[PDB]
Design a protein around this nucleic acid. Sequence first.
DNA 1: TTTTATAGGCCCTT
DNA 2: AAGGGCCTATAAAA
DNA 3: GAGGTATGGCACTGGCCGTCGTTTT
DNA 4: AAAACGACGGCCAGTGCCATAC
Lengths: 1012, 369, 367
Amino acid sequence: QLRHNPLDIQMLSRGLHEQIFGQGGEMPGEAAVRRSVEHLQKHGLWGQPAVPLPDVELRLPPLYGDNLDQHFRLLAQKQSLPYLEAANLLLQAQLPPKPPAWAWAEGWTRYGPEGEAVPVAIPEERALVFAVAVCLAEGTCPTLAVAISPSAWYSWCSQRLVEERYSWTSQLSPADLIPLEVPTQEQLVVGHNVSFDRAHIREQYLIQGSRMRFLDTMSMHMAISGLSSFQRSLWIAAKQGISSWDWLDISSVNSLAEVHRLYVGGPPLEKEPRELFVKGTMKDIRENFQDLMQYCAQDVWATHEVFQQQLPLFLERCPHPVTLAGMLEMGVSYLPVNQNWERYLAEAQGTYEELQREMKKSLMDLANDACQLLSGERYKEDPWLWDLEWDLQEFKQKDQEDLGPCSEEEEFQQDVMARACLQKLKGTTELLPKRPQHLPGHPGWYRKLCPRLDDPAWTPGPSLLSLQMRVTPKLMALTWDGFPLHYSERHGWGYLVVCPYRAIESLYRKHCLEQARGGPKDTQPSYHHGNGPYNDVDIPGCWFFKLPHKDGNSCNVGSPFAKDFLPKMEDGTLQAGPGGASGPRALEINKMISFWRNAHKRISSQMVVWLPRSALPRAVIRHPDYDEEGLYGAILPQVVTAGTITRAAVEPTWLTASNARPDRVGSELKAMVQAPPGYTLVGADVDSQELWIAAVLGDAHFAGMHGCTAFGWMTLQGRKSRGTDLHSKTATTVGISREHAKIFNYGRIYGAGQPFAERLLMQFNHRLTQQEAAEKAQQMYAATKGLRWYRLSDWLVRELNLPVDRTEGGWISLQDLRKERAWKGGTESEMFNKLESIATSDIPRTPVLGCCISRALEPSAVQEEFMTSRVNWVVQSSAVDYLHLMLVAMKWLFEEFAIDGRFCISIHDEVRYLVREEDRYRAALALQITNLLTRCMFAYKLGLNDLPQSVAFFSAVDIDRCLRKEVTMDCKTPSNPTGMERRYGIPQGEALDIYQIIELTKGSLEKRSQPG
Amino acid sequence: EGSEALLEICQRRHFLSGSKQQLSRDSLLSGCHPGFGPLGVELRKNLAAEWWTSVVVFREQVFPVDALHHKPGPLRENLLHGALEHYVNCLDLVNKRLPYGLAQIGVCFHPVFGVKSIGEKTEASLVWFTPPRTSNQWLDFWLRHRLQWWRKFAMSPSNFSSSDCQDEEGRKGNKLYYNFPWGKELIETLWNLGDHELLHMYPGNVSKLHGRDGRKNVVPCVLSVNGDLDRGMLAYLYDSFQLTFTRKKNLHRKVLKLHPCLAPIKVALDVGRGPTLELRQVCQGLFNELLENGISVWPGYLETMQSSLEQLYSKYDEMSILFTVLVTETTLENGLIHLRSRDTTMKEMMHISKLKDFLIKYISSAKNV
Amino acid sequence: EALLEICQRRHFLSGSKQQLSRDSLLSGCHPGFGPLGVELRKNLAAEWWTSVVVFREQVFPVDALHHKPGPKLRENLLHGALEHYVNCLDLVNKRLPYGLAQIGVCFHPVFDTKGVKSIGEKTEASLVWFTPPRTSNQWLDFWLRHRLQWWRKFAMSPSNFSSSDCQDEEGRKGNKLYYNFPWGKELIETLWNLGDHELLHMYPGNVSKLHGRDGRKNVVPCVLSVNGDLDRGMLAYLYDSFQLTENSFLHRKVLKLHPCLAPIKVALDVGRGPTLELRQVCQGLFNELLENGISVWPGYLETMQSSLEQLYSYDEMSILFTVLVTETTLENGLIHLRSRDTTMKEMMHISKLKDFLIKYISSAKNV
DNA sequence: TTTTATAGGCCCTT
DNA sequence: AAGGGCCTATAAAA
DNA sequence: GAGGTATGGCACTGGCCGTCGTTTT
DNA sequence: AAAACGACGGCCAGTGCCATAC
Ligand SMILES: Nc1ccn([C@H]2C[C@H](O)[C@@H](COP(=O)(O)OP(=O)(O)OP(=O)(O)O)O2)c(=O)n1
């Protein structure tokens, strides 16, 4: 049961290859083998030693259909059939007119054809168009909602809206949410950004799986007519007031109004002018109940019409059922949480505050000293603080001996006299200007730094200070290689009302003691070297240089306190004026707190719904880990199923959640998602998903072999112990470090070019002078993606009959008469050519699932305009197809073999499921089977039946109790210093190989067959 | 060094009493110093008040307790023993809900090498009875909170450091240090003492000591947090004087940048030149108003005019007074008074009616920064 | 009396029944005070400090050691103030009339035949007033007046606080203050005109260091020593709060302690209903009151396992007001408020409760 | 306010 | 090491 | 012909409307 | 005593830069 590829690549086991219908496949030819072997010899990647892989034999679950493609088609069709039926019921539905007036009754009310409002428990409907409104001021509890179903309107009101109550529960429960699910037959809910609506229906927070699925008009809109973020800016600017703009009239931003404009058109829909839910209070919502209900019904109606137009387009444009099934599965994602979550939040915030306060204190103290420079007018002699405003204003206008003690009446009269005399001054106070001044007796910059007194959140001193303010580098007197810093308007931060150049020169002389156009008047040269423009800004002493930037000379430095300047701080090029460790400590604090400063408003505001003991299942209740005093609940991430042009998921918080880092304050965020007692999380991340997709596409384009191209060979059988791995070979060919080679390759593969490589080379070794470095980059590119050959693609043979140049292909020749672009020999040239072919085809479609690109990216609309976007879209949408395949296969395996589990989360590469502790090992086996099947499906759709044993199975599945990159991570953070185990009773999980899983599970997914 | 100038300022500004030789580092750290001046006493009072507000006031399970100074009753070394004695009686306060504390601030006496003498340290102790299952967690909690409390009023909070330590009997604990210019000195100790001392204190029926851990009864583990408030006051005094440089040394202004909550004197009040009777009347009224709202004021207007405004500003800065208030002939006309901040040395105009509210808001907000 | 039993039960006084006796309490050898007693004594000391130190521009805090090094224990705070006198004279630029105030524990011998000898502790508040002799006696009367008023300030029966005049062997005037306990009068504060003999004996030679300015002339100050027992004062106020039976019309008993001195101002408790909702609302109100400086007894942490009458019989703890939060409060925000003094029950909105308590305390202070 | 039920806790049963 | 005896305290309640 | 796709925050700047002080018959 | 005008300041959108994820 051992197979080898004709390129001597360890293949799928002969036992398993025949089970993936390998028998009766195509036989690879001989000339293709000769060409591939010659290519590998030319790239020096042929004949390398191979380490055999232990072949895996196991009875696979039944495979339906003739081939794997029919298998996946059947599975996805079965999974999505009822929801397609419900969507068709919505599609071919004639709706009654909405009621003339709305109910204003607690709960659900159904409106009859004559407008009569009959209360109902839940809408007894299989398909609904849904829109939920929440009072943002009151928190996260839904306030009112409207639903459309075939021949029925429904409106739901909250008890917190109908009933006036002094207090409601701060901690939400499913009883507070709205009911939709029918008890024990499967429902479909359609909405615009339907995840937000889903987060407000109670039954979706139960641990058990729910047969209700969701369809998002945003996701389908991105699938059919979407645009990139740059394309979004272009579209918005064009509609507000690149050579071809034909794509404007076929795509729009994801807002419901413009989606209705594109797909439905006709009369525009008007938004709420006051935004009462977003801004107003609950009283405002009550006072405008009918209008707000009408607006919600308008949103429901617009979404319904949009869905009616979209569904035929989406089904036509993504014809494979796997895409729809994967979108439905991604619609419902579950994040289990416990009380620890809350503590986490508090702890994180507390830590953040402390780390902030310290920093602020430092900065504030500096300001409190800088004012002294106004006393001696020495601010104009300061090499940093002479740029600031130091203005001040005025207020507005039009011995005896011991007398002894005193009488009781005497001191009484003295006290009352003092009080009465003091009252006169208050009486005078009420005669001076109504508008008070803000620090008239302080400098202008210090007045800017201080909060105004009438601010509700006021703190003493210049509390507004932060490391990101322009004044802060001046206050710390930051010095770059002996140079005071400065702020040029057009070019950010660099290193150098009359400028004190004598003081700057004295400071530089002192620094040297501690250890280029040449105008001596005004702007000056430096006999020193560096990047940036020099003489655009005029200074009397002007050896001006821009700070180095990781994004080239064209870019500018917005803050010296950025995380990438900590290495320069440790080097000593960048230094602090006060000295010691004030600078390094400030940069360390900034590094620690940047993630939380960005993400606290999202993480804290995340919506938790806590299940009561009654909602808790009996398995959870009867478990030793069940703490009755504790709280168990869920967060439903608000994922847009297809939020990018690549149809990838978009979630503001959880798809960008940082992994645990020892310095990042809130980095234990994903670890805080902890399974309930009796349940564990079984997850896995795909091994080099994008790299392998690109490699297999290149291999299929070049020949019928796996690893026939050099890039595919490297991706399949790289090894860091010796050479022959991709990064090490790139480093050996170029001449720089292996980490630099890795960053070069990963930057390039996303559709990069010459400037990126030249900039990275210059940043890495300034010692290599610009043009030399450029040549180096060029050579790198000639090795990776060979030189372009135009091949008569500008007529061209007629112009060639001059005769001038030779050969049947071009040499990027330029004619300058003013009367199929391929690549050449290179390891990645074949995959680049395949990607360009897919991008430039008339209707670019994903090679596996056949999903089309957006109508705003089709060549007929964007001819030769967005090329990097399309070539990157090919790989990224292929990854999305891979994700959909995995989801469909996992759903099929769970529903087939009765694995008590649920889809938890998917972060691009990672997929994690919430399984029972009993069936965690069966779930791991199912995950391995699904990975094998998805890789084989990719291979078959490309054209190759066999699959390398290297990528056949997952590297290792993670069985844990929380989301971590590795089960061994203890998630030490500033906010979680004690560690995961010592803070909360969460032990380390385990990583299981395919061999370990099969040994544990006897190679079966059946509960009876599982050993005990 | 700048330590000599700081001690000279403290001696001159009545932060520390006694002669220069009596205020040696050994004398100060041992607790055998002659005593504190009024400013030092007030600073220590503010520090103890902040400790009480951060431990006792905002916790339902922490109660005040008074322990006697003499052990036999037929001297005191630590406040732990009195709280351990009061544990059973005070258990009734929480209906035996086990996690609860007894807090006390008082003077303890320590022998040191006549040939041997006795030093006094006013220390603040919290004895926290906790269920054993959560003892280490509570220890970590208190460690974090105490360290944060020490760093809260510090100009250079990094000087306050925490270390982990082990008992010879295997009991975990944490120590807190302040980095004086000569090195680190111990200022607070947190120990997980178990229940051995508590059990030895009540021989016979152990059921008398049982406390409720939720639905379970267990003999509590005793957590002892003991901080030296004298050494803390000394540390904050050293922290107010920046020993660091460059332009900071060019300024070279002798100021004690004490935290507003800890500064012994908040405001300084003085008169200018003009009609003395009216100015004295208005200053007496303002002084009474400010005192009535609990804001400490230094009555500089009672002294005649012998020093300049610069001399007054330097004297007040050495006394760590937050604000200086000047009443002139202008105040009699339009009611505006001159307010000078210690931090920025900048002068501002403020009307008298707004002064009390502004000062109270400043003091209250200083905690919330 | 039954008052001692109540103090034992309500954690005003610590120790057993036999350890708490009239002789033991007066001698100062009692085991110690309960948390409520400690808070009452702290409030009393704060009231003393606000009426003596911040009251006068010339009064400064002082720290005196407890052991008086040299091979004994402290008996009075006078010695420490006299030691700090010369150093603090520079604080006032030798402006002679000025004071040093201090509150601290002093030790005195105590023993009984039943023998050996024991040590008792008394927490005393001392004011040492250096005044020119020409007005010294006048100042003495002043302080006497003030001290008497202060004792009468918080007293339900100020007539029990009495003042007596006494004379030294060498003709120095002084005053004593007494409280009328049920068994008789007991001394609680002492004021003496000590001349300058202790001060001169403290500095043999260099008498020029002790000179203080008084109308451009230099004179050695006269020392006035005011010494009050805060322990016995707290005991006196406890006895004064136990004015026979309770209010309204079982003969239960209430301690009508002064609002400024009462250790606990308000008590918070829940009624019948959703425990989580009521506890959340009570926690919010508790945090609000603490942030506004109102001492609160957190009874909601025990729910309401006891009856309403036993819960009110807080009266033995001298709590000014009792607040009950029910499921009705979740609807309209109204809570039940019971006053200790009048025993009247009222409905009040939570929003007004903190303001009402603060205004009540402020008016009690200004009366 | 029990009383019977509910988890504690401690002495005895393969 | 288990589960099954003993009293036994708890908290909302028929 | 471009390192790609998303998310989001903070600091800084400019345009517009309300208020207040100042100036005219 | 009514009418024109300039200055100061707050609110919101746009822009640049930085920080996360895959
Ligand atoms: N629990 C995990 C964590 C990670 N990975 C894999 C997915 C990533 O693709 C891989 C990291 O690959 P590098 O880019 O770091 O490459 P290697 O270090 O694996 O390759 P080389 O041997 O060439 O250095 O880790 C995994 O399978 N399971």
